[PDB]
UniProtKB/Swiss-Prot annotation, chain A:
The gene is HTL1. The keyword Nucleus applies. Required for cell cycle progression through G2/M transition at temperatures higher than 33 degrees Celsius. Component of the chromatin structure-remodeling complex (RSC), which is involved in transcription regulation and nucleosome positioning. RSC is responsible for the transfer of a histone octamer from a nucleosome core particle to naked DNA. The reaction requires ATP and involves an activated RSC-nucleosome intermediate. Remodeling reaction also involves DNA translocation, DNA twist and conformational change. It is found in: Nucleus. This is High temperature lethal protein 1. The chain holds residues 17 to 76 of 78 of the full protein. Present with 3550 molecules/cell in log phase SD medium. Keywords: Acetylation, Cell cycle, Nucleus, Transcription, Transcription regulation. The lineage of its organism: Eukaryota, Fungi, Dikarya, Ascomycota, Saccharomycotina. Interacts directly with RSC8. Component of the two forms of the RSC complex composed of at least either RSC1 or RSC2, and ARP7, ARP9, LDB7, NPL6, RSC3, RSC30, RSC4, RSC58, RSC6, RSC8, RSC9, SFH1, STH1, HTL1 and probably RTT102. The complexes interact with histone and histone variant components of centromeric chromatin. Component of a fungal-specific module (HTL1-LDB7-NPL6-RSC3-RSC30) within the RSC complex. GO terms for cellular component: chromatin; nucleus; RSC-type complex. The keyword Acetylation applies. It comes from Saccharomyces cerevisiae (strain ATCC 204508 / S288c). One of its GO terms (biological process) is chromatin remodeling.
UniProtKB/Swiss-Prot annotation, chain B:
This is Chromatin structure-remodeling complex protein RSC58. It comes from the Eukaryota. It is found in: Nucleus. Component of the two forms of the RSC complex composed of at least either RSC1 or RSC2, and ARP7, ARP9, LDB7, NPL6, RSC3, RSC30, RSC4, RSC58, RSC6, RSC8, RSC9, SFH1, STH1, HTL1 and probably RTT102. The complexes interact with histone and histone variant components of centromeric chromatin. Component of the chromatin structure-remodeling complex (RSC), which is involved in transcription regulation and nucleosome positioning. RSC is responsible for the transfer of a histone octamer from a nucleosome core particle to naked DNA. The reaction requires ATP and involves an activated RSC-nucleosome intermediate. Remodeling reaction also involves DNA translocation, DNA twist and conformational change. Present with 4460 molecules/cell in log phase SD medium.
From Swiss-Prot, chain C:
The chain holds residues 154 to 195 of 1359 of the full protein. Belongs to the SNF2/RAD54 helicase family. It is found in: Nucleus. Catalytic component of the chromatin structure-remodeling complex (RSC), which is involved in transcription regulation and nucleosome positioning. RSC is responsible for the transfer of a histone octamer from a nucleosome core particle to naked DNA. The reaction requires ATP and involves an activated RSC-nucleosome intermediate. Remodeling reaction also involves DNA translocation, DNA twist and conformational change. It comes from the Eukaryota. The gene is STH1. This is Nuclear protein STH1/NPS1. It comes from Saccharomyces cerevisiae (strain ATCC 204508 / S288c) (Baker's yeast). Present with 1990 molecules/cell in log phase SD medium. The lineage of its organism: Eukaryota, Fungi, Dikarya, Ascomycota, Saccharomycotina.
Amino acid sequence: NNVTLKNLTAFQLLSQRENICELLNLVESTERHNSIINPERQRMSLEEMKKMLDALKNER
Amino acid sequence: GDDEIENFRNGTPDKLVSDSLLKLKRLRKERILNKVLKPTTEERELYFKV
Amino acid sequence: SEKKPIKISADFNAKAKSLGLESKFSNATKTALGDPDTEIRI
């Protein structure tokens, strides 16, 4: 919750290193990439959108 | 003791000396970790043996 | 060994460790001379 010079430099360096290691394909981030996408959450949100759209369609 | 006679007849007394020095060092470390000054009897015996 | 040797996750403490920066988020390191027991012994 506190930000010092050490924390800032470490954060920036970590981001840079992660990006570069991803360029060389030296990292497997399936867990993060599927917790952010979360296809289950995608299906849930899609069904919620469909239900809301049907509700708006039938009120007329 | 018999250990000396064996480790002489069977050669390699140096192994006995090295093991005894290691035991002495370990005993001294344990003697330092809890504050006590006088070495125990077994330490004197290992020293005499070496 | 064969596959990607990093395997980043969503922990940020294993992620930071796997890329080298492990102690770089703590204020001060851990030492031995900070306990009163070792001080009393010395």
